[PDB]
Amino acid sequence: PVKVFGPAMSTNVARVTLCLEEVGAEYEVVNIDFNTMEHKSPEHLARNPFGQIPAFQDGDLLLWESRAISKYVLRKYKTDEVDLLRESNLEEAAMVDVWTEVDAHTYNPALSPIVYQCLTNPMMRGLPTDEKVVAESLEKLKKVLEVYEARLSKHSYLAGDFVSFADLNHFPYTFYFMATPHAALFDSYPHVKAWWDRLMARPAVKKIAATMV
Amino acid sequence: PVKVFGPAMSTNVARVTLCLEEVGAEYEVVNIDFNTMEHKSPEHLARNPFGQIPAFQDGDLLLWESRAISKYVLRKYKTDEVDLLRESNLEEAAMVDVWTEVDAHTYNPALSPIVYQCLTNPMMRGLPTDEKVVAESLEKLKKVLEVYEARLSKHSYLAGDFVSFADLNHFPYTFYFMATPHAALFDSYPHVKAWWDRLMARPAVKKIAATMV
Ligand SMILES: N[C@@H](CCC(=O)N[C@@H](CS)C(=O)NCC(=O)O)C(=O)O
Ligand SMILES: N[C@@H](CCC(=O)N[C@@H](CS)C(=O)NCC(=O)O)C(=O)O
C-alpha cells in the first residue's frame, strides 16, 4: 500500500484521502498527534521538512503538500474510466488548473476563516470566535459564490461537464462549513447547492465523510 | 500571438511573462490600469470573473490564475529541449509539484509581506511600513531559508539537478525582495544565494527583469 501521515479529521488529509478512494488505490492512514508535537518530531521532519501534516510515502518516495500529493496519486493510478486531471486534452486540463487555484487563492481564504473561528477555536484549542472576522469573511464569501452560481448554471462541474480534481479540492473545507450555523447560506445559491449534493452522493465522498467525525 | 493582461511591473504577471520567454513563444502584454479600476471593468470580468490581474487569451481560450496560465503555457509549447514540468517522469513531476506549492503556501506568505510593506506601501499607495509585520515575517523567513539551504546543498535546483517551474515560481517576488534593505539576508544562506545567481544569469530571466522597472 501507500502511507498517508496525519489525522483523518484533518481537511488537508481528507484532500489526499479522497483522491485515493476515487482512484480505488490500497492505502493506510498512519495518524500523527498534535498534542504530543509529533509533527515537529524528527521522524516526521524526515517526511516534511516544515513539520506540517500531511506527508506521503510510496515505498522510498516521500512527498508533502496535499495538492502535490493528490496530483501524484491521480497521475499514477490513472485508469481510462478515471482521468480526474484530463492531461490528454490540454484545454480541459487548463480549466482544472484554474478552479484548483480558485480554491487555494479565493474560495478557501474566504471560507476557511469561518470554520477555524466557528469550529476549530471552540471545539479544539478552546479560545472564543471573533464576530469581526466571521462577519467580514461571510460578505467576502457571498460575492465569491456569486461567481460559482454563474459557472455552475452553465456547467455541472467547475471544470466542464465532468468531475475533476477542481471539484474534489472544494470538498474537505466545505464539508466543515456545512456544520457551522451558516451552512444555510448555500440554500440562497441553488446551482451550488445542486453541485454540492451531486458531490455529497458519490460513493468515495460518502466513505471519506465517515472519516471526519 | 497570445495576450497576457496586466502591468509587466506586476509579480503574478512576471510569473507568466517568464514562462513564455523560457519557452520562446510569441506574445503581447496588454496593460491594465489599477488607478482607473480597469480590472473591475466589464471587459476584464469577461476574462477574470474575480476582476484580478493577470488573465490570458489564446484565441478563444480565456484563462486566469498565474500558475494555471503557466502550466498551460509550459504543457502547450513543450519542446524536448525544454520540459520544465517533467510530465514524462512521474517522480520528477511530483518534486516540481511539491516546491511549486512550497512557494505558494510557505515561502511567498513569509516573503511577500516584507515587499508589500517595505515597497508597495511607500512606493505605490503611500501608507507607512509596519515594524511589527516586517520583523515577524523575517524570523518566519529565516527558518524557511534554513530548509532551502539544506535542499540546495544536495541539489542545484529545488526539484532535482534541473531547472523546473518550481525554480521559476520563486523568481518574481524574490526579485523585489532583492530591492528592500533586507536583501543582504540571502548572503547568510550561501547555497540559496548560489541558486539565486544561477537563475539571475539565465537569458529569459535577464529579459523579464528588464520588465520590472
Ligand atoms: N497547505 C499545506 C499544509 C497544510 C497545513 O499546514 N496543515 C496544518 C494542519 S492543522 C498543520 O500541519 N499545522 C501545524 C503547523 O503547520 O505547525 C498543504 O498543501 O498540505
Ligand atoms: N493569486 C492569483 C491572483 C493574484 C492577484 O490577486 N493579483 C493582484 C495584483 S496587485 C490583484 O489583481 N489585486 C487587485 C484585486 O484583487 O482586486 C494568481 O494566481 O494570479
The DSSP code sequence of A56-98 is EEETTEEEESHHHHHHHHHHHT-BTTB-SS--SSHHHHHHHHH
Report CA torsion sign: B81, B87, B91, B97. Answer: positive
Task: Say how far apart CA B108 and CA B104 lie, in whole Å.
Answer: 6
Beta carbons within 8 Å of B184's beta carbon, 6+ residues apart: none
Identify from A16, A64, A105, A145 which residue to disrupt to test chain B contact, counting B C-beta atoms within 10 A and taking the largest count. Answer: A105
Task: Say how far apart CA B158 and CA A195 lie, in whole Å.
Answer: 38
Lateral strand order in the sheet of A61-64: A27-30, A2-5, A55-58, A61-64
Q: How big is chain B, counted in residues?
A: 213
The conformation of residue B183, written as its DSSP 8-state character, comes to G
Residue B197 main-chain phi, psi, to 5 deg: -55, -35
- The method recorded for this entry reads X-ray
Resolution (A): 2.8
Task: Say how far apart CA B175 and CA B184 lie, in whole Å.
Answer: 13
Contact A2, A25 (CB under 8 A): yes
Q: What CA–CA distances, in Å, run from A153 to A139, A140, B60, B86, B183?
A: 21, 21, 21, 36, 48
Q: Kind and range of the H or E element at B61?
A: strand B61-64
Q: Is B72 within any annotated ligand binding site?
A: no
Q: Kind and range of the H or E element at A15?
A: helix A11-21
Q: Kind and range of the H or E element at B94?
A: helix B90-102
Q: What CA–CA distances, in Å, run from A184 to A109, A177, A181, A187, B212?
A: 20, 10, 7, 5, 46
User: With an 8 Å Cβ cutoff, is B105 touching chain A?
Assistant: yes
**CA B64 to ligand 2: nearest atom:** 20
Residue B84 grid coordinates: 520544465
Task: Say how far apart CA A137 and CA B170 lie, in whole Å.
Answer: 29
Omega within 30 of 0 (cis) for the link into A54:
yes
Q: Is B11 within any annotated ligand binding site?
A: yes
β-sheet bridge partners, residue A57: A3, A62
Chain B: residue whose CA lies nearest to A96 = B68
**Contact assignment for A68 to B104 by CB distance below 8 Å:** no
Residue A76 grid coordinates: 499514477
Task: Say how far apart CA B86 and CA B67 lie, in whole Å.
Answer: 16
Closest CA to A9 of B14, B94, A1, A17: A17
Residues of A in contact with B93 (CB under 8 A): 71-72, 75
Q: How far, in Å, from the CA of B64 to the mean position of ligand 2?
A: 10
Please, what are the domains in chain A?
A: 2-76 (3.40.30.10), 90-202 (1.20.1050.10)
Residue B27 grid coordinates: 506574445
Residue type, A133: V
Contact B88, B47 (CB under 8 A): no
Contact B2, B76 (CB under 8 A): no
